Structures are given as C-alpha cells and as structure tokens.
Ligand binder design. Structure first.
Ligand code: HEM
Ligand code: HEM
Ligand code: HEM
Ligand code: HEM
Ligand SMILES: Cc1cccc2c(-c3cc(C(F)(F)F)ccc3F)nn(Cc3nnn(C)n3)c12
Ligand SMILES: Cc1cccc2c(-c3cc(C(F)(F)F)ccc3F)nn(Cc3nnn(C)n3)c12
Ligand code: FES
Lengths: 122, 88, 181, 38, 384, 384, 88, 122
C-alpha cells in the first residue's frame, strides 16, 4: 500500500542525520536479520507485493539476469517453505547481498505514476 | 481480466528459462525419509524460532488477566468487602 | 547433459511391483474405510427417517372390545388406518359358507379371514388407492370402495372393481371380550 | 462394487467393537445385572 | 479436450478442485477454507434432519427437541452434531480469519474477497444466534430478549422496529416461528455468499505463507491439496467426534436445557463461547446504541484493515513487530471473549473497556504504525 | 474494460443478462424461461413468508394455515400467491416444454440442457405434491396416502420403504414434518438445478424460431429482450392478480379446506389440475408398479425425444406434418389431463388407456417416422 | 470449448463481408408505424396460415372427447342403466 | 440426427421408380411450398441443422459466393421473422432456386466420416 517513494523518502529523512542513523541502523540490521527471509534464499525486494500495477511494471522492466535470479530465489524460497527446512548460514543470503536491486525500477515507475497524476489534476 | 493469476499456460509468472527442476517418481522414493528426524528436530526448531513472538504477548496478557482475577477474588472475599463498597 | 543430484539415499528399497502394490493397497484401504464411515453415517441419518420410538409404541394398541349389535360395523384407529371391526351375525357366516374358487381375484373363506364370526376384524383401507370403504354400499353386501365403486364381500374378498387384492385383515388377535394386537 | 469392501469393514469393526465393549463393560450391563434383581 | 474440461459442470469442478493452480508453499492453514465448507454442509444436513422433527411452535419447541433426543432414532446424534458443529464452524472461521490476518491475505488483490468474507462472518453469527433461539431454553429466550431490546436503541425506528421483528409485544410464538424460518433460510443465502467468496478467490487465486507471487511454482489442487484437505477433514471429524460423543454439552450452556419462561431470569445471561468476544464489547460500552454500534464495528473494521495495513510486504511471516502485534491482538481477543462470560465486576468492567479499546486500536493505530515502521526498517537495513 | 465486465459478479450478470447474445428472431415464447425464474423467486418468497407462520405439526397444520388466512396481516395474500403461483409455475413450465418441443430446442447441441430441464420438471412436481400435503386437507391427506401406497409396489424394497418415508405406519405428524422440511429444501436444490440449466443453455446459447444458426444476427439480452421479459412479466403478474384476488380458489379443490381425517374418504381423490395428465396414466395402467413406472416414463421419455427425432431441421415452424403431429400431441395431453380428474367410468377408462398409448406412441413412433418422412419429402421436393 | 456459439467478437458465424445493415435511431423513428395495420391484417394472416394445423387435431380430439362424454352421460341416465350393467 | 447420406439414399430409392415418384414428387413439391420457408427467403439447405461437426465442416468448405448468399438469406429470414412479415410471391424464393447447393459438401463430409469409421473399426 505505502508507496515505495514514501518509504525511501522517510529512510533518507532518517539517514541524513547521524543522530538517528547511529541509533536505528543497527536496529534495522538486526531486525532484517531476525526477519528470517534471508535464510530462505530471499532478498528484501523479493518479498515486495508484486500484485500492483506499479510493481508489475517494475518487474517487467527488470533485466534478464536479475529477473532469472529473482525467479530462482522465489522458487527456492517456495521449496524451502514447502519442505519446512532452511538454508544454513553458508547458503543463506548474506547481508551484503541484499542489494535492493528492484528499488530503482519501482521508484522510476512511481515517479511516472506521480507525474501522470500531478499533470492530469491541474 | 488482468487477474494477477492466470491459468496453467500463462500463470502471470515472468520468464524463468535458466532454472531446472528435478523430482523422483514417488513410487521410487521413501515416504518417511525425514519423518523421524523432522518431527523432533525440525519441529523443535520451528517452535524455538517462533516462541518469543507468542510468549511475550501471552505472558503480558496472562499477567494482566491474573492480576484482574486475583483482584476480583480479593474483592468478593470477606477481607475485601469494605474495599468492594469503596470502589463501587 | 548435466549432472543430476544424487538420490541414492532417497531411493526406496522395494521392487517395482512391491512399492506400487503397497501404495495401491493403502489408497484402496483409505477409500474403503471412507466408504464404511460414509455408509455408517448415512445409515444413521436415514434411520431418522424411520418410525421414531413414539410411533412404534403407539402402534399395536389394543381396542376396547365387547358386546355390540350383530351385523354392526364398528370403527377404530389402529395405526391410523380405520379398522372395520364388525360382529357379523350368523347370516354372514352362512353366506360365506358358499365357497368360491372362481370369479374371485383371491378366493378365500372365513376359515382364514376371521377367527370367529362373533368378531370380524378387517382394515378399512382399500386395495387400489387405499381409501375407507363405505360400510353398507358394497355390491357384494360388505364394504364398498367409493373411489372406484369396488365391492368388498362380507368375508373381505374383492368381488368387483379395481381391487388388486382382498380387504386386508389386521394381525389383531382375539381374547375374552378384548382385542389383543 | 465398492460397497462390498465397505460392508465388510463395517461388519468387522462393528463385531469387534461390540465384543470388546461387552467384555470391558460386562458387569455394568443390564443383561448381566438382571439376574441379581430377579 | 479431457471430459473434465469440455463439460461445463466438470469444467467448473476442474477449475475449482482439480486443476486449480494453488501455490506449492501453502501450509495446512490454507485447508481451513474447505473445512469450513464441509462444516456448512454437515450443518445443513443436520439442520434438515432436525427440521423433519423440530416443531417451530413456542410451546412445542423444547419438547420437540427433547423428542428428537429421546425418541427419534439417532436424533441425539444429529442434534449434538448440529449444536457442536456450530461451535466448530466458528472455530474454523476464527482460525480462517486468523490465517488471513497473519499471512496478509486481506491485501490489495483480494480486498474484494475480504469484504465478502467479512459479510459471511456477520451473516453466520446472525444465523447462529437465531438457531440458538430455536431451542427456547432459558438462555435462548433471554438472549433473544436481550438482543431484540438492544435493537430498540435506534432513535428514529427503534421504538417500533422491535415489535416488528418480534411479531408481538415480546419474544413469543411468532418470534420463534420467524426465527425458525429465517434460520432455515439464511444458511442457504450464506451458501450463495460462500460461492461468491470462492469466485472472488478464484479470480486472483490464493496467497501463500511467504507472501510472494505463487505463479513461479503452482501445483494442481488435486491430488496434493485434495489429500491435504482430507487430512485436515479427518482431523476435524475426529475432534468433532470427541466433542459430539464423549463431551457434547461442554461447549453449550446447561441453562439452555431449562424450559424457557419470561418470568424467571437466569443468574447469568451469556452467549455461547464464540459470541463472547463481541458480547464483551456490548457489555463494556455504556450506551445501548453505542454498544451495538461498537459490537458490529468490531467485525466491520476488518473492512478497514486492508487500507490501514500500509505494509509493502504481504503477510507477517517475515515481520517481527507485525507478528508480535498480531499475537498480542489474538491474546487480547481471547481475553475479551473470556471477559464476555464473566459477570460485571469492577476489574472485569474496566478490563473489558480497555480490551475493547485495544481491539479497535489494533486496526486503527498499530497496523498502520507498525507496517510503516517495518517498511522503513527493511529499507534502512538493506540500504547498506 | 467496463466495470460490468471486469468485476467477477458483474461479469457474470453481464454474460447472462446484459450482453448475452440472443438470436434476434426469438419471439415471446422465449421469454417464458425468465418468467419461470420469477415464478420460482416469488414462490420462494411467499413460501418463506408462510414458513414464518405455518406449523408443521399435523394437529396445527391446517389450523395454522387458517391463522395465516384470517389473523396474519396479508396472510391471505401470501397464501393465495403461493398456492396459485404453484399452478402458474406449472403453466409456465408446460408452455416452456411446449415451446421446446415445437421449435426443436431439444436437439443435439442442447441435449444436455434438455436432460437438466427434464430433471427439473420431475423435481418440481415432487415439490408441488409435497407442498400440497402440507395443508393437510382431505385431498392433501388422501393424495399423500395414495402416492405412498403406490410407492409400495416396488417388489424388493416396497414392503418396508413406505413406513420409511412415512415415519410411521400411516400418514401422520412425522410424515407432515418430513414433507415440510423436504418441501422447504427441495425448491432450493431446484434453485441450483436452475443455475445448472442456465449454464447448460449459455454454453451453446438459445435456439430461435427459424431453427437455424443465430450467429448471423445476434442482439444483446439488454435492452431488447430485457424489455420483452418485462412485458411478459407484467402480463403474467396481471393474470396472476386476476386469479389471486378475483378468483383464487378456482384452480384449487374445495375439499382441501376440510380438515383431513383418515376415516372419511372424499368422493373423488384427484390431484390439482396440472398433475392430472400424469395421474390419468396412473389410473389407466392396471398394475400399481406398472402404473408408477408409466407415470414416470411419461416424463422421462422426453429424454429419448432428442434421439427419436431424426429430423435434419431444427424445430417445426417449417414442417407441416411435424406441426400437425405436435398439435395433436398437445390436444391428446390436454385430453389426458381432463380424463385425470374424472371418475373411472367405462368410456373414460378405455379413452385413458388409448390416450396414454398415443402419448407414448408420439415419442416412440410418430416423431421418428414423421421426421424421416419429412426429410425425404424435403429432399425429393427440392431435388427438381 | 468448441461451443457452437461464441462471444460477440466471434459468435461462430461464417464470413459475411458483402452484407450491409441499415437502421434509424429510434430517437427519429415512429414506434407505431405498423401497429394499426399489423394488429389486424398481419395477425389475421398468421392466424389463417397456422389455423389448419391447430383445427384438424383439435377437431379430432374434441370429437372423440364429445363422443366419450355423451356415451358416459347416456350410461348414467336411466335409459342406459341396463347397458351400464351389460358393459360392466 | 439422420445422416444426409441416408435421406439422399432413400430419396434415390424412391425416385428410381416412376411408380412411386409420380405419386410422391407432386406431394413433396406441395409440402415444400406449404412448408413456408421459401416465403422467408430461405432455401432448404439453409434450414439444415448447422450445429453438427459434419455440417460445420460442410459449411466451412462452401465457396465464398455461396457462403455470402447463404448469410444474406439467413439474415433476411431472421429479419422477416423478427418483423412478422413475409416476402411476396415476387420476392419469395421460387421453387427452381432450391438448388440443393449444400448437399454435395454435406455428402462429401459424410463419406469421409463413414470411411473413417469403417476403416478404424476393422
Ligand atoms: C464460511 C465459509 C467459508 C468458506 C467456504 C471459505 C472458502 C475459502 C477457501 C477454500 C479458501 C482458500 C483456502 C483457504 O483459505 O482455506 C478461502 C480463502 C480465504 N478466505 Fe475463506 N472461506 C470461508 C470463510 C471465510 C470468512 C468468513 C472469511 C472472512 C474474512 C474468509 C477469508 C478468506 C481470505 C482472506 C482468504 C484468502 C486466503 C489466501 O489468499 O491465502 N474466509 N476461503
Ligand atoms: C451456518 C449454519 C448454521 C449454524 C451456524 C447454526 C447454529 C445453530 C446453533 C448454535 C444452535 C443451538 C443448538 C444448541 O444450543 O444446542 C442451532 C440450533 C438449531 N438449528 Fe442450526 N445452525 C445452522 C444452520 C441450520 C440449518 C440449515 C437448519 C435446518 C435446516 C437449522 C436448524 C436448527 C434447529 C432445528 C435447531 C434446534 C434443534 C435442536 O437443537 O434440537 N440450523 N443452530
Ligand atoms: C417450486 C417451488 C414450490 C412449489 C411449486 C410449491 C407448491 C405448493 C403447492 C401446490 C401448495 C398447495 C397450496 C394449496 O393447496 O393451496 C403449497 C403449499 C405450501 N407450500 Fe409451497 N411450493 C413451492 C415452494 C415452497 C417454499 C419455498 C416454501 C417455504 C419457504 C413452501 C411452503 C409451503 C407451505 C407452508 C404451504 C402451505 C401453507 C398454506 O397453504 O397456508 N413451498 N406449495
Ligand atoms: C423451472 C425453471 C426454469 C428456468 C429458470 C429456465 C430458464 C431458461 C431460460 C431463461 C431459457 C432461455 C429463454 C427461454 O427459453 O425462455 C431456457 C431455455 C430452455 N429451457 Fe428452460 N427454464 C426452466 C424450465 C425448463 C424446464 C423444466 C425445461 C425442461 C425441458 C426447460 C427446457 C428448456 C429448453 C429446451 C430450452 C432451450 C430453448 C431454446 O434454445 O430455444 N426449461 N430456460
Ligand atoms: C444468550 C445470549 C446473551 C447475550 C447475547 C447473545 C447473543 C448475541 C447475538 C448477536 C447477533 F446479533 F449476532 F445475533 C450478537 C452478540 C451476541 F452476544 N447470542 N446469544 C445466544 C447465542 N450465543 N451464541 N449462539 C450460537 N447463540 C446471546
Ligand atoms: C390428491 C392427489 C391424488 C392423486 C395423486 C396425486 C398427486 C401426484 C403426485 C405425484 C408425485 F410423485 F410427483 F408427487 C405424481 C402424480 C400425482 F398424481 N399429487 N396429489 C396432490 C397434488 N396434486 N397437485 N399438487 C400440487 N398436489 C394427488
Ligand atoms: S378405491 Fe382406488 S381401487 Fe379401491
């Protein structure tokens, strides 16, 4: 529901101030680690709700290699959920591998949608 | 009908060419390969991972309920009668 | 083309027929256990359609017998169907003495249709489209089926009409001035 | 065709359960108690 | 084309039960749906087999029920099946809704589905209560009286609508006959809403625990999920047999076996267990109109849940704070239900007010705040 | 996409009522279907509003009906609406089937539809009879007795099945309660068969008077045929008002207002008018088992009609001999119905036997022979 | 789904290129252009064309019914009593 | 239902004998005239039940000009039935235009189907 643009704006709002970054960033890292999605072979962007015209547009706009890697990650996560087993730390998605690859495309789609809404509303 | 799920021919999934799937005919595989190890180790793993999220809310709510129940019991006991008159 | 993952551990130790035979046995056993359970449930439910204990208790209820005018036809309500309890006089017995092996859909005699002429019991429900026959309109002298005009003989035999059989005689037994169903 | 196995299972379970229940509830049944109140 | 796909009816049955592309990752919590259907079916069956022996008349109602118990062959079995199957239907529905909340099945693509579901829930309670009034036990009679009196709180039409629903000046033979008819019917309207719910599901398919697209890996409902449905169905029937045969009256209230008389009020007028959470709210709110408004809002706010859930990720399986909040909400709901059956004691009245407050606060604050905070935390964590 | 085509429910409503491509050449005879639906709806509505005041108990049934007539506000109106709407439902259904036979809507593409329709017809009468037994008038009681006795004719299970359906040793309170429950339900199972019939129709669409492909010129159901349906609905409701208000009891039988008692048999045990054609057959066949077999065959042979109709041309509008045979069949059916209500007099019994003979001979001889002869005549005429 | 009727885009009709259709907005046309002439002349034409097929079967069936009814009436009157006994 | 081949065979069975042709042919002509389909602009072949795989195949193989003429005739018949009016004798289909244009194609399709059934049944 929340626009990816809004959450990115809030994250940059916080990150611009070390007073809050030094407090929240460790908490955010711990919360992402405890979220449990990495151990299933998923990156943050894979969890995003696809069933949204903006999101579907962004995925359709994704490069072939990234799209195939995402397909494999989703399939692996589904298999792990089905088998009720998790990857070990060796095979789990390392924190540095959460590259937020899909955020640029989603932000571009959101910018296009917002421009459309702004222009047609005048 | 831009449903986010289609039928088998086109389920709405993106192209996934470089992935390969593998399975054995069930007539050739064990049904109980992991049952013994799973039911203990895997079940305990799931329970341990999910415990805190159930325990903390449960302990909070049950502590509140126990406090309320004990207070009510004290009220309706003779020793609490006067207080029952004071509170009401 | 490429290396497959090793299933060595995953493999079953059974032969081709053994594993398939056991799987089909288990599936068939599940199917037939489900069939047995569904049969039990459906029979238990359908037994609700059957007469409840109240109805069974109410039936087989004796009738207050006793002295009554000869030739008069009494009425009862045993098991809903009217009962044509009539104390036909000796004239009816004498008339029934004339045997009939022909011109009767079911030749019979008072030998089996009644225990004693002093008390004659017969359900009033007719044969074809069961109705209550009139007690004096019978063409043969007994009861008459108004719906089709069928005539019931004094012995209950079907004389004329669409009667498929003879006037049924309930299973009521007789006793000392009492009816013992 | 199926009804045969279903009926066989029904009868098997019914007779087995009835026998076991009667033996386990022997003393408490009316049939065994009536003699004492005769 | 296979005959299951050419024939229109077999085509529909295939689309819904045989080749329906369910996600491969759906766990047993997704088998409750079919379970609920089974429950409805069994209920209707039992209900029909009770209508053949139940008498709607007020003077014959309870006596006819006892006739079913004592005289009708297997009448006790059908009566208990119906009564306990109402409770089991609501257990399955509560777990159904709990799964929907936990795994975020209420989000955008299935919002339509959500609303139908919510309607069904309301309708179902407005079928359960009515059924409970048919027995015309002490609890039945006084529950009918209490609910109809609460209906009078409406300002403009409440003064005369209550006799309209009663059919008289108080709960009497017209009321029980009316409830019997509407209660025989409303489950059959609900069978239509169940079909509508199934179609609203089929348009977009079913979610999965991971909260991501199932299109990458789908499996036909038959045989896999058909047999999972059989497992859950046999488990449900086994527990249902435990209750029906070995402990049927524990879920019910003993006072309902007392022939109802308006002149005697039981010491505690309380609904069956599964209406307790809502009735608690009704007890907590002072104003009668406010009480009924809040009681129905406690259900209808589920319609607002999809819009108050600002999460960019479906479900909670990967959401620490959301899982904690959801479990706290579930335990608060259980506490509210538990308070529902207790008398009006000082700590209980204050705790019921606080419990209703937090029950609504969940939807209107916690889900928004928690979801936004968690989106921010995810992005600011993975940003490195 | 318009909202009427994207939304699943509005999509279905569109596919069936808005852009359903009906042939442009369909006359008013094709509006009976919707009419029947309306009839069913109104019946259900009336029925529900009767269930709220009717008592299933045998001792209270007729008295409760009179309570509806005399004391319940608009109770007379609803009672008469239900009673006369049964007859009007069967009038519409008979015209429905007559149209299907005349315009050959029973041929290959819609055979499935035909089958469903036949089932519905049977079900409908097995709902009408049930309803007629609820009032427990003299005719009600004795009709129930006659029918249940006829069911005893089955050799292996007929001896004990009759008590099973009765719930006792004769028509009594269990029988009336059972009929009340089954009669409230079976119409709702028939509401499902109506939907099945509609889908079996929608798969191949509706026929047309000309008996040729409608695909050359199709028009949306709305507005044209929606407004034609409105015309026929208002005409039907106007005639229904005539009967309900100004002459309600003409279709019924006076004896049904006598409280039923098993001890007194009315001079003539006869069904309502629209069961007469079938009961006539039941009267004509000597054997009870043979009688019931022939009575149900008189309906089921409609299932054989599509295969016995060897015509290469759909419908009869362009078929002299077929039209003549169909009209003679219709008049024979009317004569059979008329004989149904008369006593068993000599000329009437022989005429009933001959009428049944020709009624079955229609399907099993005339349609085959006439259709083949007409195909031959067409080809040998146009061959020049 | 080889249904012999499809949806609007493809109703299953064959190619019909060389046919043209013409209609006037109802907002511009008479509703009652033919009503007066139709209801009499056209209705009489339809009735006359379809009459024989209704009349001949109706005449046959009603003649048989009249014969049967008259015979039964004669039977149940006094003059027919003896024959009623003879036939039965 | 009846195969067009069977009806054609019966018609030739009759026509081969003047003893029966001289009796039935006038009757058949009168029956077709009274059938009332000609006054609607239809030919006999237009009345044939299209909804049959053999009939659909025969129609599909029909020449373009015949197919278009048939489409126009069917449309005209539908319009006439809709308007409850009939063509006058001048505009009606004269007996000589009932050319049985579709029979050859239907017979070809029937022969193919019968050959298939006969061959696969051995
Ligand atoms: C009362 C009878 C019900 C029937 C027959 C039914 C049927 C189903 C079925 C079969 C499913 C898919 C499998 C499953 O979720 O178990 C489903 C999904 C769902 N149901 Fe129901 N259900 C019922 C009750 C409800 C109610 C009252 C709600 C109200 C919120 C509800 C909410 C949902 C949701 C949100 C989903 C989507 C789940 C997902 O996508 O993962 N269900 N329904
Ligand atoms: C969603 C569907 C239904 C639900 C949730 C439901 C619920 C209930 C409940 C909770 C009771 C109270 C029983 C007790 O207190 O022991 C009850 C009683 C009853 N219901 Fe239902 N009901 C449903 C459908 C039906 C149907 C379909 C029928 C009839 C066709 C029916 C007829 C009755 C009758 C006759 C009783 C009282 C009979 C007795 O207990 O002896 N109900 N129902
Ligand atoms: C296709 C649907 C139905 C048909 C054809 C039908 C037919 C009939 C008929 C012929 C009667 C006899 C009335 C008389 O002799 O005056 C009757 C009575 C009755 N039916 Fe229906 N019925 C239908 C559906 C229903 C429904 C849905 C209900 C209840 C919801 C219902 C409840 C009753 C009752 C209570 C009576 C007797 C009440 C009275 O006459 O006062 N029936 N029905
Ligand atoms: C009882 C409720 C019924 C409903 C709701 C219903 C509904 C419909 C509708 C709306 C149509 C299309 C319009 C029309 O034909 O008037 C139709 C067609 C048809 N119906 Fe029914 N109908 C009913 C009864 C029956 C029955 C009992 C039969 C049994 C044979 C039947 C046989 C047919 C046939 C053969 C058609 C196809 C007509 C054609 O294609 O021209 N109908 N139905
Ligand atoms: C006995 C009793 C007392 C107080 C309230 C109720 C209710 C009740 C009904 C509704 C609804 F409007 F939905 F009808 C809402 C809230 C409620 F508290 N119902 N009952 C009897 C009962 N309880 N549970 N069942 C299966 N029946 C009460
Ligand atoms: C009063 C009466 C007498 C004789 C027969 C009947 C029937 C009847 C019922 C069935 C069916 F098996 F379908 F039930 C079939 C044939 C029948 F002749 N019914 N009735 C009462 C009645 N008549 N018309 N209605 C609306 N009810 C009779
Ligand atoms: S009354 Fe129908 S045959 Fe006896």
């Amino acid at each position: 529901v929340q626009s990816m643009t809004s959450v990115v704006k809030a994250a940059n709002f916080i990150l611009a101030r070390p007073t809050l970054s030094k407090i929240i960033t460790p908490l955010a890292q711990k919360f992402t680690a405890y979220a449990g999605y990495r151990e299933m072979g998923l990156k943050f962007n894979d969890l995003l709700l696809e069933e949204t015209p903006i999101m579907q547009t962004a995925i359709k706009r994704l490069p072939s290699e990234l799209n195939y890697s995402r397909n494999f990650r989703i399939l692996t996560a589904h298999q792990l959920a089905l088998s009720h087993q998790l990857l070990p730390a060796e095979k789990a998605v390392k924190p540095e591998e959460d590259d937020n690859y899909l955020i640029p495309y989603i932000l571009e789609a959101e910018k296009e949608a917002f421009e459309k809404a702004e222009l047609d509303n005048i | 009908p831009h449903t986010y799920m289609g039928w088998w021919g086109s389920l709405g999934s993106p192209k996934q060419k470089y992935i390969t799937q593998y399975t054995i005919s069930p007539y050739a595989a064990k049904p109980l390969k992991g049952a013994a190890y799973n039911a203990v180790f895997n079940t305990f793993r799931r329970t341990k991972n999910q415990f805190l999220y159930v325990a903390i809310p449960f302990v909070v709510v049950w502590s509140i309920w126990t406090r309320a129940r004990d207070y009510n019991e004290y009220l309706y006991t003779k020793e609490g009668r006067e207080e029952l008159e004071r509170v009401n | 083309n490429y290396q497959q993952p090793d299933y060595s551990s995953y493999l079953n130790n059974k032969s081709g027929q053994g594993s398939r035979n056991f799987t089909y046995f288990m599936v068939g056993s599940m199917g037939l256990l489900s069939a047995a359970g569904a049969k039990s449930t459906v029979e238990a439910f359908l037994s609700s359609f059957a007469a409840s204990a109240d109805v069974l208790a109410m039936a087989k209820v004796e009738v207050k017998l006793g002295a009554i005018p000869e030739g008069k036809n009494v009425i009862i309500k045993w098991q809903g169907k009217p009962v044509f309890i009539r104390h036909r006089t000796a004239d009816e017995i004498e008339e029934a003495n004339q045997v009939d092996i022909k011109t009767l859909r079911d030749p019979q005699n008072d030998a089996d249709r009644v225990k004693k002429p002093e008390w004659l019991i017969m359900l009033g429900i007719c044969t074809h489209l069961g109705c209550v026959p009139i007690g004096e309109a019978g063409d043969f002298g007994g009861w008459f089926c108004p719906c089709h005009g069928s005539h019931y003989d004094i012995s209950g035999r079907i004389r004329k009409g669409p009667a498929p059989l003879n006037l049924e005689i309930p299973e009521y037994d007789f006793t000392d001035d009492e009816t013992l169903l | 065709t199926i009804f045969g196995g279903a009926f066989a299972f029904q009868g098997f379970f019914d007779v087995a359960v009835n026998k076991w229940w009667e033996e386990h509830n022997k003393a408490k049944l009316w049939k065994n108690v009536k003699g004492k109140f005769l | 084309m296979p005959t299951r796909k050419s024939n229109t009816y077999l085509s529909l049955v295939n689309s819904y039960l045989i080749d329906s592309p369910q996600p491969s990752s759906i766990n047993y919590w997704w088998n409750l749906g079919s379970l609920l259907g089974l429950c409805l079916v069994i209920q209707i069956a039992s209900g029909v087999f009770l209508a053949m022996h139940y008498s709607s008349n007020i003077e014959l109602a309870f006596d006819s029920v006892e006739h079913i118990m004592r005289d009708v062959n297997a009448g006790w079995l059908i009566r208990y099946i119906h009564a306990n199957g109402a409770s089991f239907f609501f257990i399955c529905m509560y777990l159904h809704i709990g799964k929907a909340l936990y795994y975020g099945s209420y989000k955008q693509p299935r919002v339509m589905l959500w609303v139908i579901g919510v309607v069904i829930f309301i309708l179902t309670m407005a079928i359960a209560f009515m059924g409970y009034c048919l027995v015309y036990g002490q609890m039945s009679h006084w529950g009918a009286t209490v609910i109809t009196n609460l209906l009078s709180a409406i300002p403009f039409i409440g003064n005369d609508i209550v006799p309209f629903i009663w059919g008289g000046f108080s709960v009497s033979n017209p009321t029980i006959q009316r409830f019997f008819a509407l209660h025989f019917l409303l489950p059959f309207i609900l069978a239509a809403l169940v079909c509508m719910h199934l179609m609203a599901l089929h348009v977009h398919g079913s979610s999965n625990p991971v909260g991501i697209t199932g299109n990458i890996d789908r499996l036909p409902m038959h045989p896999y999920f058909i047999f999972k449905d059989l497992i859950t169905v046999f488990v449900f029937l086994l527990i249902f047999s435990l209750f029906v045969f070995y402990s049927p009256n524990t879920l019910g209230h003993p006072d309902n076996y007392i022939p109802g008389n308006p002149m005697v009020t039981p010491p505690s007028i309380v609904p069956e267990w599964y209406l307790l959470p809502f009735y608690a709210i009704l007890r907590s709110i002072p104003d009668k109109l406010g009480g009924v408004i809040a009681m129905f809002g406690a259900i209808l706010i589920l319609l607002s849940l999809p819009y108050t859930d600002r999460s960019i990720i479906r479900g909670n399986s990967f959401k620490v704070l959301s899982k904690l909040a959801f479990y706290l909400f579930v335990f608060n709901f259980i506490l509210l239900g538990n308070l529902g059956q207790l008398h009006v004691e000082v700590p209980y009245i204050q705790l019921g007010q606080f419990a209703t407050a937090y029950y609504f606060a969940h939807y209107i604050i916690v889900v928004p705040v928690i979801s936004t905070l968690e989106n921010i935390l995810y992005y600011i964590g993975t940003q490195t």
